[PDB]
Design a protein around this motif. Structure first.
Motif, PDB file in Angstrom:
ATOM      1  N   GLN A 169       0.822  -1.209   0.000  1.00 43.73           N
ATOM      2  CA  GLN A 169       0.000   0.000   0.000  1.00 43.73           C
ATOM      3  C   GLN A 169       0.858   1.262   0.000  1.00 43.73           C
ATOM      4  O   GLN A 169       0.601   2.208  -0.760  1.00 43.73           O
ATOM      5  N   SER A 170       1.883   1.294   0.856  1.00 44.89           N
ATOM      6  CA  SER A 170       2.807   2.422   0.877  1.00 44.89           C
ATOM      7  C   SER A 170       3.371   2.706  -0.511  1.00 44.89           C
ATOM      8  O   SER A 170       3.495   3.866  -0.917  1.00 44.89           O
ATOM      9  N   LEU A 171       3.682   1.655  -1.268  1.00 41.39           N
ATOM     10  CA  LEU A 171       4.091   1.843  -2.655  1.00 41.39           C
ATOM     11  C   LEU A 171       2.955   2.386  -3.511  1.00 41.39           C
ATOM     12  O   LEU A 171       3.183   3.227  -4.389  1.00 41.39           O
ATOM     13  N   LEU A 172       1.727   1.891  -3.301  1.00 43.73           N
ATOM     14  CA  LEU A 172       0.596   2.384  -4.083  1.00 43.73           C
ATOM     15  C   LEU A 172       0.410   3.886  -3.907  1.00 43.73           C
ATOM     16  O   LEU A 172      -0.050   4.571  -4.832  1.00 43.73           O
ATOM     17  N   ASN A 173       0.767   4.412  -2.731  1.00 45.13           N
ATOM     18  CA  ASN A 173       0.698   5.850  -2.482  1.00 45.13           C
ATOM     19  C   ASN A 173       1.760   6.649  -3.234  1.00 45.13           C
ATOM     20  O   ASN A 173       1.574   7.853  -3.440  1.00 45.13           O
ATOM     21  N   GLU A 174       2.864   6.030  -3.636  1.00 44.62           N
ATOM     22  CA  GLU A 174       3.962   6.785  -4.240  1.00 44.62           C
ATOM     23  C   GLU A 174       3.591   7.215  -5.654  1.00 44.62           C
ATOM     24  O   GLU A 174       3.434   6.368  -6.538  1.00 44.62           O
ATOM     25  N   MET A 175       3.445   8.530  -5.867  1.00 39.97           N
ATOM     26  CA  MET A 175       3.126   9.085  -7.179  1.00 39.97           C
ATOM     27  C   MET A 175       4.148  10.082  -7.697  1.00 39.97           C
ATOM     28  O   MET A 175       3.944  10.638  -8.782  1.00 39.97           O
ATOM     29  N   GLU A 176       5.205  10.372  -6.947  1.00 37.25           N
ATOM     30  CA  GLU A 176       6.164  11.396  -7.344  1.00 37.25           C
ATOM     31  C   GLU A 176       7.455  10.829  -7.895  1.00 37.25           C
ATOM     32  O   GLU A 176       8.011  11.393  -8.834  1.00 37.25           O
ATOM     33  N   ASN A 177       7.939   9.726  -7.336  1.00 33.98           N
ATOM     34  CA  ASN A 177       9.177   9.095  -7.762  1.00 33.98           C
ATOM     35  C   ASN A 177       8.853   7.747  -8.390  1.00 33.98           C
ATOM     36  O   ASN A 177       8.240   6.888  -7.744  1.00 33.98           O
ATOM     37  N   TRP A 178       9.255   7.568  -9.646  1.00 33.24           N
ATOM     38  CA  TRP A 178       8.999   6.339 -10.395  1.00 33.24           C
ATOM     39  C   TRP A 178      10.214   6.032 -11.267  1.00 33.24           C
ATOM     40  O   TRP A 178      10.218   6.291 -12.474  1.00 33.24           O
ATOM     41  N   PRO A 179      11.268   5.481 -10.671  1.00 30.50           N
ATOM     42  CA  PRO A 179      12.442   5.067 -11.453  1.00 30.50           C
ATOM     43  C   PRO A 179      12.055   4.313 -12.717  1.00 30.50           C
ATOM     44  O   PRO A 179      11.267   3.359 -12.679  1.00 30.50           O
ATOM     45  N   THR A 180      12.606   4.754 -13.848  1.00 32.24           N
ATOM     46  CA  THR A 180      12.204   4.287 -15.172  1.00 32.24           C
ATOM     47  C   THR A 180      13.393   3.650 -15.882  1.00 32.24           C
ATOM     48  O   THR A 180      14.514   4.164 -15.813  1.00 32.24           O
ATOM     49  N   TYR A 181      13.142   2.551 -16.593  1.00 29.97           N
ATOM     50  CA  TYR A 181      14.183   1.666 -17.098  1.00 29.97           C
ATOM     51  C   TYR A 181      13.913   1.302 -18.550  1.00 29.97           C
ATOM     52  O   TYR A 181      12.759   1.049 -18.919  1.00 29.97           O
ATOM     53  N   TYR A 182      14.978   1.261 -19.359  1.00 29.60           N
ATOM     54  CA  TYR A 182      14.942   0.900 -20.767  1.00 29.60           C
ATOM     55  C   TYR A 182      15.971  -0.200 -21.048  1.00 29.60           C
ATOM     56  O   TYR A 182      16.899  -0.382 -20.273  1.00 29.60           O
ATOM     57  N   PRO A 183      15.805  -0.947 -22.135  1.00 31.76           N
ATOM     58  CA  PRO A 183      16.762  -2.035 -22.401  1.00 31.76           C
ATOM     59  C   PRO A 183      18.182  -1.494 -22.514  1.00 31.76           C
ATOM     60  O   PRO A 183      18.409  -0.440 -23.108  1.00 31.76           O
ATOM     61  N   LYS A 184      19.138  -2.222 -21.916  1.00 33.28           N
ATOM     62  CA  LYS A 184      20.521  -1.749 -21.847  1.00 33.28           C
ATOM     63  C   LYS A 184      21.042  -1.366 -23.218  1.00 33.28           C
ATOM     64  O   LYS A 184      21.704  -0.342 -23.368  1.00 33.28           O
ATOM     65  N   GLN A 185      20.720  -2.158 -24.236  1.00 27.40           N
ATOM     66  CA  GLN A 185      21.365  -2.013 -25.533  1.00 27.40           C
ATOM     67  C   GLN A 185      20.960  -0.741 -26.271  1.00 27.40           C
ATOM     68  O   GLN A 185      21.666  -0.341 -27.201  1.00 27.40           O
ATOM     69  N   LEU A 186      19.861  -0.089 -25.890  1.00 27.14           N
ATOM     70  CA  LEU A 186      19.453   1.120 -26.595  1.00 27.14           C
ATOM     71  C   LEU A 186      20.439   2.263 -26.359  1.00 27.14           C
ATOM     72  O   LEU A 186      20.923   2.477 -25.246  1.00 27.14           O
ATOM     73  N   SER A 187      20.738   3.001 -27.420  1.00 26.47           N
ATOM     74  CA  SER A 187      21.483   4.237 -27.260  1.00 26.47           C
ATOM     75  C   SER A 187      20.565   5.312 -26.683  1.00 26.47           C
ATOM     76  O   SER A 187      19.340   5.154 -26.622  1.00 26.47           O
ATOM     77  N   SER A 188      21.167   6.419 -26.240  1.00 25.77           N
ATOM     78  CA  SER A 188      20.358   7.475 -25.638  1.00 25.77           C
ATOM     79  C   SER A 188      19.424   8.098 -26.662  1.00 25.77           C
ATOM     80  O   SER A 188      18.345   8.592 -26.305  1.00 25.77           O
ATOM     81  N   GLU A 189      19.798   8.049 -27.935  1.00 23.04           N
ATOM     82  CA  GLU A 189      18.959   8.599 -28.986  1.00 23.04           C
ATOM     83  C   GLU A 189      17.779   7.680 -29.289  1.00 23.04           C
ATOM     84  O   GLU A 189      16.668   8.160 -29.533  1.00 23.04           O
ATOM     85  N   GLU A 190      17.988   6.359 -29.250  1.00 24.51           N
ATOM     86  CA  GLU A 190      16.863   5.432 -29.379  1.00 24.51           C
ATOM     87  C   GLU A 190      15.867   5.622 -28.232  1.00 24.51           C
ATOM     88  O   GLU A 190      14.648   5.674 -28.460  1.00 24.51           O
ATOM     89  N   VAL A 191      16.375   5.792 -27.001  1.00 24.06           N
ATOM     90  CA  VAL A 191      15.537   6.100 -25.842  1.00 24.06           C
ATOM     91  C   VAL A 191      14.722   7.382 -26.071  1.00 24.06           C
ATOM     92  O   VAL A 191      13.514   7.425 -25.830  1.00 24.06           O
ATOM     93  N   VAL A 192      15.395   8.450 -26.505  1.00 22.73           N
ATOM     94  CA  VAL A 192      14.695   9.715 -26.754  1.00 22.73           C
ATOM     95  C   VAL A 192      13.610   9.522 -27.800  1.00 22.73           C
ATOM     96  O   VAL A 192      12.488  10.032 -27.654  1.00 22.73           O
ATOM     97  N   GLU A 193      13.921   8.797 -28.877  1.00 17.32           N
ATOM     98  CA  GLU A 193      12.935   8.589 -29.931  1.00 17.32           C
ATOM     99  C   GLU A 193      11.714   7.832 -29.407  1.00 17.32           C
ATOM    100  O   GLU A 193      10.577   8.241 -29.647  1.00 17.32           O
ATOM    101  N   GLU A 194      11.923   6.735 -28.669  1.00 14.27           N
ATOM    102  CA  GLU A 194      10.777   6.024 -28.097  1.00 14.27           C
ATOM    103  C   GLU A 194       9.980   6.930 -27.179  1.00 14.27           C
ATOM    104  O   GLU A 194       8.746   6.875 -27.161  1.00 14.27           O
ATOM    105  N   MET A 195      10.667   7.776 -26.410  1.00 19.13           N
ATOM    106  CA  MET A 195       9.958   8.623 -25.460  1.00 19.13           C
ATOM    107  C   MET A 195       9.072   9.643 -26.165  1.00 19.13           C
ATOM    108  O   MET A 195       8.046  10.055 -25.611  1.00 19.13           O
ATOM    109  N   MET A 196       9.436  10.054 -27.375  1.00 14.48           N
ATOM    110  CA  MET A 196       8.629  11.024 -28.117  1.00 14.48           C
ATOM    111  C   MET A 196       7.550  10.334 -28.953  1.00 14.48           C
ATOM    112  O   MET A 196       7.399  10.576 -30.151  1.00 14.48           O
ATOM    113  N   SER A 197       6.780   9.466 -28.298  1.00 18.41           N
ATOM    114  CA  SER A 197       5.696   8.735 -28.942  1.00 18.41           C
ATOM    115  C   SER A 197       4.610   8.368 -27.931  1.00 18.41           C
ATOM    116  O   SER A 197       4.654   8.773 -26.768  1.00 18.41           O
TER     117      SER A 197
END
Ligand SMILES: [Zn+2]
Ligand SMILES: [Zn+2]
Ligand SMILES: [Zn+2]
Ligand SMILES: [Zn+2]
Ligand SMILES: [Zn+2]
Ligand SMILES: [Zn+2]
Ligand SMILES: [Zn+2]
Ligand SMILES: [Zn+2]
Length: 184
Positions: free
Chosen positions: A156-184
């Motif tokens: 429940q304490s986790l269910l309350n957390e709405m401000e911090n949400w560590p976000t993860y992408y596959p290791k092999q992606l470059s930062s530009e591939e990450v940016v491109e996916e994020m802009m969709s």
């Protein structure tokens, strides 16, 4: 590659009867925290695109929002054969997590999301007792990127957390591939 049910569900609109269980294997792989990408300015085009498409907020304000959201010192997460291990300060912790169902949440905006809950029952493990995956998917499908909530108090304490949400992408992606996916 998304059915339009999946499509609208990723946008937070769905009926509770369409949600389905997911196995931990939907998250198999090696994942990089995107916080270092933020801290080096590499996500800035995302924040500027969002700032240019929204009259109420400036670049800096969006950037600060995601600086709070993404902040974490779990740099990588590896998931395989039922085990999640968390990389922090050149050391890892790991646990064989047990699935504990999902929880459907309604956000203050009216959009909805599903959190998939897991629990560590290994008295030997030093990993977080409770984790929750959230990745805009509400039925079995290999994840493309995920938010994770981790904690040692309660689910429940986790269910309350709405401000911090560590976000993860596959290791092999470059930062530009990450940016491109994020802009969709
Ligand atoms: Zn319901
Ligand atoms: Zn302002
Ligand atoms: Zn390993
Ligand atoms: Zn295997
Ligand atoms: Zn490591
Ligand atoms: Zn999200
Ligand atoms: Zn908090
Ligand atoms: Zn995505």
């Amino acid at each position: 590659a998304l059915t339009e049910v999946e499509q609208k569900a990723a946008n937070g609109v769905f009926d509770d009867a369409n949600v389905q269980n997911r196995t931990l294997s939907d998250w198999d792989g090696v994942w990089q925290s995107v916080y270092p990408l933020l801290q080096s300015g590499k996500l800035d085009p995302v924040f500027q695109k969002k700032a240019d498409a929204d009259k109420t907020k400036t670049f800096a304000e969006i950037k600060d929002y995601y600086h709070k959201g993404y902040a974490t010192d779990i740099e990588m997460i590896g998931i395989e054969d039922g085990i999640v291990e968390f990389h922090r300060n050149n050391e890892t912790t790991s646990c064989k997590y047990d699935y504990d169902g999902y929880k459907i949440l309604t956000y203050k905006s009216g959009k909805k999301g599903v959190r998939y809950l897991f629990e560590c029952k290994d008295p030997e493990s030093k990993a977080p007792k409770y984790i929750q995956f959230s990745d805009h998917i509400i039925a079995p499908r290999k994840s493309s990127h995920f938010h994770i909530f981790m904690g040692n108090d309660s689910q429940q304490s986790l269910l309350n957390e709405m401000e911090n949400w560590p976000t993860y992408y596959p290791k092999q992606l470059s930062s530009e591939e990450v940016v491109e996916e994020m802009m969709s």
